[PDB]
Amino acid sequence: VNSFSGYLKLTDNVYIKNADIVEEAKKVKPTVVVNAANVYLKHGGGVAGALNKATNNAMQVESDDYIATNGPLKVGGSCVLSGHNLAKHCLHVVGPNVNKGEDIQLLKSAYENFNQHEVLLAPLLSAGIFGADPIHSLRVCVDTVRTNVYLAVFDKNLYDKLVSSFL
Ligand SMILES: CC1(NS(=O)(=O)c2cnc3[nH]c(=O)[nH]c(=O)c3c2)CC1
């Protein structure tokens, strides 16, 4: 038993809710919250900008030190940093950005990072401003992640379409 509430159960291991990931994180304080990161960990907008704003920019300060030491992530890659006031840890995962021409096949590699963590609160990778079809992203998630994932979907309209079209 864990503290996630109100989720619809899609599969053995995937759950979905219409929620603001920032507010969900604030209340659950999960072990891991996933950020929809870019390779530079520049958290300017989308999920990343919202998470970072909720940390009062501490996420960005930590991220800038990480990049200065290690250089950029790979598309499809990830790193574990602090969860600040939102979670114990933040798993920064880089899904492909269709609006930059990145290969959508890398979405599966991005979701594979989730398998290193037993339980996660996460957004749909490559959705929103990253330009992928969220229905495709949900399918890849279900077919790739084997650990327990609680998906927060900000847009209520989108949430209903994802549920109603789920096979
Ligand atoms: C498919 C969807 N877009 S998104 O990329 O996942 C996203 C973008 N910005 C967000 N800002 C925020 O404050 N809370 C969020 O949950 C959030 C989620 C509708 C979820």
Curated annotation (Swiss-Prot):
Domain of life: Viruses
Effect annotated for changing residue 31 to A: In strain: Mu/B.1.621
Reported regulation of activity: Inhibited in vitro by GRL-0617.
Domain Macro stretches: 1-167
Catalysis: reaction(s): Thiol-dependent hydrolysis of ester, thioester, amide, peptide and isopeptide bonds formed by the C-terminal Gly of ubiquitin (a 76-residue protein attached to proteins as an intracellular targeting signal)
Subcellular location: Host endoplasmic reticulum membrane
Bilayer topology term: Multi-pass membrane protein
Subunit structure, interactors included: May form homohexamers. Interacts with N protein.
Function: Responsible for the cleavages located at the N-terminus of the replicase polyprotein. Participates together with nsp4 in the assembly of virally-induced cytoplasmic double-membrane vesicles necessary for viral replication. Antagonizes innate immune induction of type I interferon by blocking the phosphorylation, dimerization and subsequent nuclear translocation of host IRF3. Also prevents host NF-kappa-B signaling. In addition, PL-PRO possesses a deubiquitinating/deISGylating activity and processes both 'Lys-48'- and 'Lys-63'-linked polyubiquitin chains from cellular substrates.
Protein name stated in the entry: Papain-like protease nsp3
Source organism of this protein record: Severe acute respiratory syndrome coronavirus 2 (2019-nCoV)
Gene: rep
Residues of the full protein shown: 1025 to 1191 of 7096
